[PDB]
Write a protein that binds this ligand. Structure first.
Ligand SMILES: Cc1cccc(C)c1OCC(=O)N[C@@H](Cc1ccccc1)[C@@H](O)C[C@H](Cc1ccccc1)NC(=O)[C@H](C(C)C)N1CCCNC1=O
Lengths: 99, 99
């Protein structure tokens, strides 16, 4: 697909039975979703946004489907105002910026 | 150009004869640059994201050259952690996400 940037590039993502709306975000190093009880081990982490840092839980090797494209990798969970798909997963679905 | 996402999509911009490094950010509605002096009558503004809110100065109709592509639009100036080129200017230079 080609995705223009006239509005926020919001897409449907799927993880283990849950559907969520998430931002395709080239300015984010990693992927963060709010409110979800993922399975497995996790470790605490701090990530920086425009106003400062939030605390998140880092889950590794989590399968996620984004616009029908399968991926697997690190998913952070914490109090993000908007669900974000970051570069760690964007690369996995073959996403580039073009102009 | 095509820009991949294994690394941060940092590119050189030119504004008021100054060269700066800025992030091409599909997750940003607005363009926000680190503290600098720009001429013109700016309006005080607040923006909130991950980590909360910052105070910025909104300058309108500012020319900026992004990888040799000319844009003229709104630029926010304040204590952003990194120079950010948002969708308002990315659309002016014909930038899309593709996968
Ligand atoms: C940098 C990073 C590292 C690891 C993991 C993650 C998720 C990371 O990214 C976190 C992050 O906030 N990145 C931002 C840019 C960034 C990178 C590095 C440091 C600081 C910031 C940006 O791309 C996304 C973020 C999304 C957002 C969040 C809450 C509300 C609305 C939007 N967008 C915004 O904050 C924008 C700003 C930039 C104008 N924004 C806020 C006003 C309303 N609308 C809007 O679009």
């Amino acid at each position: 697909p080609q995705i223009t940037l006239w509005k926020r590039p919001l897409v449907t993502i799927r993880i283990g039975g849950q559907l969520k709306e998430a931002l395709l975000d080239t300015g984010a190093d990693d992927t963060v979703l709010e409110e979800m009880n993922l399975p497995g081990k996790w470790k605490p982490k701090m990530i920086g946004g425009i106003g400062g840092f939030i605390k998140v839980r880092q889950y590794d090797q989590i399968p996620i489907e984004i616009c029908g494209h399968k991926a697997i990798g690190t998913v952070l969970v914490g109090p993000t105002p908007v669900n974000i798909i970051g570069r760690n997963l964007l690369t996995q679905i073959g996403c580039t910026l073009n102009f």
